[PDB]
């Protein structure tokens, strides 16, 4: 899999390929891997899928009981800290890395990285799972300060088609999600709107 | 396997108004018999028998714990268990230890109480209920008996004929297989009466 | 490596085991006594890892006099296998097992004479005659050879030393002394120990 | 890591009667819970007079098939006669044994009219230990074939029943019986039956359908 | 297996099973675990079936090469050794064999156990099998030297059939041999149900 | 290695390496052996009687082995070459045999010696 | 074992093979693999049978206590959850490989449970040995708003391809559909294979076998 | 090979009349990553014989030189006579069970494919020696997805055309590109007949992706 | 190790890392891994340098008798086909990733790849070490048609650049060399001629 | 594991050996003898591995033979013993190591009474006594504390006795009977079997 992140002011764009595999079988072609744990608070959810979805779960059941407790729009930094708190916890028994972002009015777009073992880091840009591995480079020269909405769109869309085609566990199609105060606008790109590259073509 | 340790053999079978259980009498430890008088089939109702093959230990255990559920039901419930119910706790007794199982095959054989239906089943050694209208092995020799079965059984047998044909299929089955054998017992069971015969077989 | 032995028969059960506690190679003990009685007329027989034998067979004769001091009347010889077998095969489970390989022998006046048999798995079944150890693979054959169903307690202590004597000839360890006792109606009888100088 | 061994599965049998022989075999080869196609014979006419069956690795029966063929061919060479089905079973258990240390994996059963004319069955270990015997079932449906082979065949375990002679048509019908039912709770076998009768006259060919899974 | 040989005052009697199994499955009820070697002197086989049937087939042709070249048959001890130099050459490779060859010469009736850990030995009674620890017993109580020929045959054969009966991988029919000076004679093969009926 | 046909035949088919081998045989010092019932008897000619010789040390008659004995004609190094080939014939043929060597046996391993030499390559 | 699931038009179609095989022997035939959990809701089970019969009994259990007090018909997605936390609490130790489907207030819903607890909605699913050859089929020929026949079609040529295909599996086919309106469970749907006639007869006359003993003891009818 | 490094995925072949047909994607991947997206497992042994290639492609490079000059020694001898599709499924059945035997195997699994004699050859080799002929074939996860659409078309009808065997093979890969996590998109077709081998170049599964928009 | 190497029209840019690193401790800071096989004939070294260095020796002894021998420039398929049968027959005993890389009258610039394993393909740009991985996206975007010999030269320092950034086992000075019909024009980039991408600011 | 037992004198030297062979846990043979006859005036006493002792020791015995035939006189026991230490220490790193434990025993004219141990390992060393097996470890104490370097072949004899009885008593196998065997200047003397 391969899940990133970026922040634009105001906001974030997350993306992630759809493919989940069991071995070298392709278990779900189409898996959502950018989940809400807000309405406003998302995580790209990298590593094996059922710890993945049941720590999603469970943050989601936590921030909201904690949102409606204080009667005020969860933060980032919150669900990130409950992520790794929980991963921490349990590091030798989960095998997950998450990328949690989001938009709050406070601190406005963010972008937090759980990788496996539970620590969190916020950062301009992140990537992980396996195809990240392929496109720290590609990111690495292409990010530039200041990018617009759109702009940090199709930087996802290319990284994230990069690492899938050098990536037989990465694949599918591409999810794109852009939070920010408006809300949440969630698009997929499929066959030809997945951005391709030349080939060698001896 | 922990389950040819003891070894054993144990097939039911259903005819026309009646049911055939039958199982071999060795009890050895990997290789010595001991004893060729071993009891591998229980009663568990009138006309409702249980058959255990497996590890000798846990054959006469889940039997006693099966009979301490059985007889509470009895009691409580003031009527005869039905052979499905039965096969239902002893589902619920072998998955009670899905983790460190008993390592047993029970069958069960009977006809119910009312309708005198015959039924017979097989269970796993983690308490996986089937129930088959033909024929139902359990043991070491399941595969040669298997075969017996699927060649000799014809539907709607008579009880002589189901005596005849589980007889054949034990014997020839547990004379091609080294850890059961010393001879086999036969119970039909019939809406009227239990007839219960020690077949002549090869003591090797 | 330790032997038991038991014979069965129309009035009686005969039963004999080794002398021989042993640590590795240096025979510690030469009148080690394996036999332990439960009960007046039952004897519980024990082999196996050393202070699992000795720890089993307390237990049981333990609670058996308990029985009898609490009800009054002894516990049946086929219950007294039962119970020890309960025993043994709940622990199988447990963390601790008790290595342990029995022969259990008694007398019933309703039932009469019974000779049981159980492994350290804890299967239990009753037996004409049966022998437990490296050396009962020896002996079994002899038992099966020449005994009878109505076998008199003469014929059976010279059957038991012919057992006895074969695993002089050719059984690897040393065996030399065996005790041997009787259980009937009157109750358990101690017999002269048949020694092979 | 690499294993030099799979279990290709498969079924073989045989007869023999006064006058005749049978060899039969499935048609089913598969590897693990796959499989590979649902017609490759099992049973190879070495000679007019004798058929060989094999099961287990399908790479070692074609090396030990082709070994047997240009082994046979040496013979009629030297001798200057075709080799007898008895010594077509030595020298294969002598071929088995030549690699006691890396074995084939292989199942093997010699079926063929010996000299005398009868019908004569030698049945292998995959190390080569070879033995005459009326009947046999060998490969991974044997201990479900064998036990009903031996009651309606050998006549064990059964009272009060005259010992007929073996013919032709009856054992015919009791390999097709018996395959069937071993097609009904085997899965590695059950594509289809290929069964070769060896006689005075020759080998023939009778294919009969089986199950499929 | 169980397989017996023992040696009286007339000569050497030879008993085994006829059972070969794999794991639990019985594959074989009949084989003729008595290896005829020569007219002279037999063997018997434990462990490997392969093993035992090559290597004293082998020690055959050896034996028909030496009696051819010498103008005079092997011992029974020369014949012993050349399978345990044979045997001893793949020590260590997984060969599991027990043999007793017997046979005649100058010296007597002569019985060697040769096995593939490499013990040669001479002896007046062996057992070499799975059950052998069961037909020992009843052998050593009923041996004699001074014996019956009918009594040695009865007890080679009831015990192998109390072997059989106790021994799982034990059974089918027993095959008895009785070597005389001659040479060797097939006396007897009674199957142990009908030994079952006899006996009890 | 030195691979040549030293004997080869002749035109009327005789080895001429064995007849002048057999020629230098008739040279050296006589031998006598005599059967007898309970006794076998050897005898030979010394040379020559140097006076200075140890006796010990020019003996022709050597025991092969403790039932066996020899004696030979010819040359002396050569007889010392079979006498030690043949010695631990016999040990070995004792070892794999539990049994005595037979003097048919020696006598036979000795001559497919002598035969393989007058056959084989550069010998 | 192949058991399969599509979403059509108004509902689910679910299918499942009818074999048991312990080990490389066909231990059992007409076997169901095809539970119920609710009358809406029903699933098939794949993995450790006894792991699949149990959890869907106590699901269904749980689900009709839960239907009972709510007083409406039990959602899919409540059922998807339960048996997901319970295998993701159990780590995979329980093996269960189950096509989840069921109709509810929401609509039509196929899930996809495996042992660890991951789930997958799907408009189309396969588990078991066989789910590759019927995964083969439904991506050659799965179409969406498919009528009634043609996914009953579908499922029944895909469970087929992994009863011939697969080795483990093999059997009679079942089908179940499940519509807003009403329920259909078919108990077998084809029969694609059967036994062939035993051409000789081996009827064991009275008197073949011998009897050493025997003890008939009657039975007081009453 | 103990261990492969570069490997290829399923390669697949199916006997239509008149000819063979046989497909294999373009590519070679180092342990998941998709290193070397443009190789062409596919040989051309001779006029009447085609050969594919799973598994380490080096492996299949060697057999390739190995191949390509026992062919070229034949076309040397000028006899007119020419190695048979079944002759080289042969020869390479046997190399493969040698180096097996040696227990330093070649990983590949094989199809060979050809028409010779106006006869279809489709035949199979394993790394272990494992060799048989059908009138389709798969290897490696192609086995698992693609032959039961073969075979099930195959089963309803035993012989098909060039169009027919050619759709069915571009079928059945984009359903391997679908479910198969080591393919690519990019594969060539290869088809022997009476005129002779013919590979054609890269080609595209043309995918659909319309499931989406469900979830 | 970051080794790659890249075809222009005329010849070929060859560039390497220069760390060698034994466990995590740099035994040699400017270590050379562009080997000369001949004059127009390169080699990029990956993997065990004991190795590497083995099979290079080799192949310039083999390479260099067969030139004198024929009196004509080797070819770099010679070249790439001698490693290739060494490395093929001693794949188990060495394991070593080489890009071979020449200029011939005939065919012009090469690049070969010849991984570990002994599979060789020729490829219009190669790139092989640990580094590889993180620039396989960066080489993948960037890479086109007609590419000069400076642009050639700039895609080589800024993919090595960024996979020594990104890799620990690769770092130090990009060492970089341009073979033509002309011949070698080896150069080396220190310190703040390396190529540097901006840091994520934060 | 078998005894093997020696003791030496002014002038002679004793050895004992158990008479037992043993598959697994059945003695197959009563009468086994472990003296080999390596020449008139030499014993090599051998236990160790099945086959093993039987074929190192006949090849020691072929090439002490052959020796003597050749050369007309015999080894001597050092020579012997340095011997058959050469042969077994050759193959110890060889694919075919000889598991086989040695006590040999001499007489020679000019050097008298000798016996010599050796380990599987082929560590050579001679000693007053010696003992092999798991019952030299009971039976060594005893030699110890009776052993005289004076001692009479009555009296060994009798300490003989006393160790072998140590064993009947304490080590659990069961070796019924002993071969004793002296060697002295006359040569090799077989004596009674001490026997229980």
New interface residues.
């Given amino acids: 899999t391969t899940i990133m992140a970026v922040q634009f002011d105001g906001g974030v764009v997350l993306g992630a390929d759809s493919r989940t595999t069991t071995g070298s079988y392709i278990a779900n072609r189409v898996t959502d891997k950018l989940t809400p744990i807000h309405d406003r608070i998302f995580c790209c959810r990298s590593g094996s899928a059922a710890d993945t979805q049941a720590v999603a779960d469970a943050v989601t059941y936590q921030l909201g009981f904690h949102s409606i407790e204080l009667n005020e729009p969860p933060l980032v930094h919150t669900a990130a800290s409950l992520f790794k708190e929980m991963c921490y916890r349990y590091r030798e028994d989960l095998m997950a890395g998450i990328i949690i972002a989001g938009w709050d009015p406070q601190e406005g777009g963010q972008v937090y990285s759980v990788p496996m073992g539970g620590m969190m880091v916020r950062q301009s840009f992140a990537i992980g799972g396996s195809g990240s591995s392929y496109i720290y480079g590609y990111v690495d020269a292409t990010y530039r300060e200041g990018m617009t909405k759109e702009e940090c769109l199709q930087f996802t869309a290319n990284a994230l088609a990069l690492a899938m085609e050098r990536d037989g566990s990465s694949g599918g199609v591409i999810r794109l999600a852009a939070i920010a105060e408006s809300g949440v606008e969630r698009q997929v790109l499929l066959g030809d709107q997945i951005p391709k590259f030349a080939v060698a073509t001896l | 396997s922990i389950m040819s340790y003891n070894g054993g053999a144990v097939m039911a079978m259903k005819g026309k108004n009646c049911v055939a259980i039958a199982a071999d009498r060795r009890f050895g430890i990997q290789a010595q018999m001991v004893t060729t008088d071993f009891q591998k089939i229980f009663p568990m109702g009138d006309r409702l028998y249980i058959g255990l093959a497996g590890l000798a230990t846990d054959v006469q255990t889940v039997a006693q714990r099966l009979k301490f559920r059985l007889n509470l039901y009895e009691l409580k419930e003031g009527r005869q268990i039905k052979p499905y119910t039965l096969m239902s706790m002893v589902a619920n007794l072998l998955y009670e230890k899905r983790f460190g199982p008993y390592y047993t095959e029970p069958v069960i054989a009977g006809l119910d109480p009312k309708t005198f239906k015959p039924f017979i089943c097989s269970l796993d050694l983690i308490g996986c209920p089937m129930v088959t209208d033909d024929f139902v092995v359990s043991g070491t020799c399941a595969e040669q008996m298997y075969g017996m079965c699927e060649s000799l059984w014809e539907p709607n047998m008579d009880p002589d004929h189901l005596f005849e044909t589980i007889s054949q299929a034990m014997l020839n089955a547990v004379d091609r297989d080294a850890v059961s054998g010393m001879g086999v017992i036969v119970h039909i069971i019939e809406k009227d009466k239990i007839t219960t015969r020690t077949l002549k077989a090869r003591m090797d | 490596m330790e032997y038991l032995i038991g014979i069965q028969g129309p009035d009686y059960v005969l039963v004999a085991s080794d002398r021989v506690a042993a640590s590795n190679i240096v025979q510690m003990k030469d009148d080690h006594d394996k036999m332990f009685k439960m009960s007046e007329k039952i004897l519980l027989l024990c082999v196996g890892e050393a202070g699992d034998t000795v720890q089993f067979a307390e237990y049981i004769q333990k609670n058996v006099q308990l029985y009898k001091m609490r009800n009054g009347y002894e516990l049946s010889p086929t219950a007294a296998a039962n119970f020890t077998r309960r025993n043994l095969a709940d622990c199988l489970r447990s963390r601790t097992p008790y290595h342990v390989n029995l022969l259990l022998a008694g007398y019933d006046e309703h039932e009469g004479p019974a000779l049981y048999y159980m492994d350290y798995l804890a299967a239990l079944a009753k037996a004409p005659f049966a022998a437990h150890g490296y050396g009962a693979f020896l002996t079994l054959s002899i038992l099966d050879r020449y005994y009878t169903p109505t076998i008199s307690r003469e014929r059976a202590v010279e059957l038991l030393r012919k057992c006895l004597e074969e695993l002089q000839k050719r059984f690897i360890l040393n065996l030399p002394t065996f005790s041997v006792r009787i259980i009937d109606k009157n109750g358990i009888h101690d017999l002269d120990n048949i020694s092979f100088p | 890591r690499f294993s030099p061994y799979v279990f290709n599965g498969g079924t073989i049998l045989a007869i023999a009667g006064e006058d005749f022989a049978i060899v039969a075999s499935d048609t089913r080869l598969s590897e693990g819970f796959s499989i590979h196609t649902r017609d490759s014979p099992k049973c190879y006419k070495l000679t007019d007079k004798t058929v060989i069956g094999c099961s287990g690795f399908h790479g070692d029966c074609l090396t030990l098939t082709k070994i047997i063929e240009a082994r046979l061919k040496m013979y009629k060479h030297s001798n200057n006669k075709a080799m007898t089905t008895g010594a077509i079973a030595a020298m294969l258990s002598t071929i088995l044994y030549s690699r006691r240390f890396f074995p084939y994996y292989v199942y093997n059963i010699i079926g063929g009219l010996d000299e005398e004319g009868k019908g004569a069955v030698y049945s292998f270990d995959p190390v080569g230990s070879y033995q005459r015997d009326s009947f046999k079932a060998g490969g991974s449906a044997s201990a479900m074939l064998q036990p009903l082979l031996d009651n309606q065949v050998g006549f064990k375990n059964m009272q009060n029943v005259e010992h007929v002679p073996l013919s032709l048509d009856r054992a015919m019908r009791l390999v097709k019986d018996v395959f069937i039912s071993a097609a009904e709770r085997d899965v590695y076998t059950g594509d289809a039956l290929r069964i070769c009768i060896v006689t005075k006259e020759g080998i023939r060919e009778e294919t009969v359908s089986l199950r499929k899974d | 297996t169980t397989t017996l040989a023992f040696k009286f005052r007339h000569g050497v009697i030879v008993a085994a099973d006829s059972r070969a199994t794999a794991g639990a499955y019985i594959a074989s009820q009949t084989v003729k675990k008595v290896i005829e070697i020569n007219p002279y002197l037999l063997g018997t086989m434990a462990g490997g079936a392969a093993d035992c049937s090559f290597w004293e087939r082998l020690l055959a042709r050896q034996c028909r090469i030496y009696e051819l070249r010498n103008k005079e048959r092997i011992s029974v001890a020369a014949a012993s050794k050349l399978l345990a130099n044979m045997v001893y050459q793949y020590k260590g490779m997984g060969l599991s064999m027990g043999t007793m060859i017997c046979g005649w010469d100058k010296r007597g009736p002569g019985l060697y156990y040769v096995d593939s850990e490499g013990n040669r030995i001479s002896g007046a009674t062996f057992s070499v099998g799975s059950g052998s620890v069961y037909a020992y017993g009843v052998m050593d109580r009923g041996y004699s030297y001074d014996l019956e020929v009918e009594q040695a045959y009865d007890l080679a054969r009831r015990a192998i059939y109390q072997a059989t009966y106790r021994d799982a991988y034990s059974g089918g029919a027993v095959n008895l041999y009785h070597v005389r000076e001659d040479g060797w004679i097939r006396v007897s093969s009674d199957n142990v149900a009908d030994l079952h009926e006899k006996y009890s | 290695s030195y691979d040549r046909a030293i004997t080869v035949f002749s035109p009327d088919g005789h080895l001429f390496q064995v007849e002048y081998a057999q020629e230098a045989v008739k040279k050296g010092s006589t031998a006598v052996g005599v059967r007898g019932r309970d006794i076998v008897v050897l005898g030979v000619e010394k040379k020559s009687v140097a006076k200075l010789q140890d006796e010990r040390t020019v003996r022709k008659i050597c025991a092969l082995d403790d039932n066996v004995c020899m004696a030979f004609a010819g040359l002396t190094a050569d007889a010392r070459i079979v006498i030690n080939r043949a010695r631990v014939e016999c040990q070995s043929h004792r070892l794999t045999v539990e049994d005595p060597v037979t003097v048919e046996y020696i006598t036979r391993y000795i001559a497919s010696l002598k035969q393989r030499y007058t056959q084989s390559n550069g010998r | 074992t192949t058991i399969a699931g599509v979403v059509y038009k108004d509902g689910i179609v679910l299918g499942a093979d009818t074999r ?3 080990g ?5 035939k ?2 169901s693999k095809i539970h119920f959990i609710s009358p809406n809701i029903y699933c098939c089970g794949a993995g ?4 699949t ?2 959890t869907t009994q106590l699901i269904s259990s749980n689900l009709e206590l839960h239907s009972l007090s709510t007083g409406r018909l039990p959602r899919v997605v409540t059922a998807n959850r339960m048996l ?2 319970m ?2 609490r159990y ?1 995979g ?2 093996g269960a490989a189950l096509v989840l489907g069921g109709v509810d207030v929401t609509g039509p819903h196929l899930y ?1 449970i ?1 042992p ?8 189309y699913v396969t588990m078991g ?1 066989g789910s ?2 019927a ?3 439904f ?2 020929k799965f179409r ?1 708003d498919m009528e009634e026949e043609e996914a009953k079609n579908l499922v029944s ?1 895909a469970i087929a ?10 059997s009679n086919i079942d089908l179940c559909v499940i519509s807003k309106n009403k329920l259909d469970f078919l108990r077998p749907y084809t029969v ?5 006639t ?3 007869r ?18 007081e ?1 009453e | 090979t103990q261990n492969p490094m570069v490997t290829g995925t399923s390669v697949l072949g199916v006997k239509f009349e008149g000819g063979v047909v046989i497909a294999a994607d373009m590519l070679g991947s180092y342990g998941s990553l998709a290193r070397f997206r443009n190789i062409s497992r596919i040989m051309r042994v001779n006029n009447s014989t085609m050969l594919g290639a799973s598994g380490d492609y080096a492996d299949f490079q060697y057999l390739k030189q190995v191949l390509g000059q026992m062919v070229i020694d034949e076309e040397l001898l000028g006899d007119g006579h020419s190695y048979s599709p079944r002759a080289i499924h042969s020869w390479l059945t046997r190399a493969m069970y040698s180096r097996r035997s040696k227990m330093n195997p070649l990983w590949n699994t094989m199809v060979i494919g050809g028409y010779a004699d106006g006869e279809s050859f489709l035949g199979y080799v394993d790394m272990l020696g494992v060799a048989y002929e059908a009138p389709s074939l798969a290897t490696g996860y192609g086995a698992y997805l693609a032959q039961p659409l073969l075979r099930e078309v195959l089963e309803k009808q035993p012989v098909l055309s060039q169009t027919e065997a050619r759709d069915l093979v571009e079928r059945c890969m984009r359903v391997l590109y679908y479910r198969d996590a080591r393919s690519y998109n990019r594969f060539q077709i290869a088809t022997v007949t009476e005129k002779g081998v013919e590979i054609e170049g890269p080609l595209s599964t043309e995918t659909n992706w319309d499931i989406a928009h469900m979830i």
């Fill in positions: 048991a095989t312990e490389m022997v066909v231990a059992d007409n076997c450790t049978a006894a792991d019969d149990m997901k936390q295998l993701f780590q130790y329980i996809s495996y660890h607890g991951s789930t997958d909605k799907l408009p040995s590759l050859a995964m083969a089929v991506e050659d969406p040529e391809a992994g009863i011939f295909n697969d080795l483990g599996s093999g694609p294979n059967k036994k062939g035993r051409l000789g081996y009827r064991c006359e009275k008197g073949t076998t011998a009897v050493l003993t025997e003890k008939i003891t009657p039975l009818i």
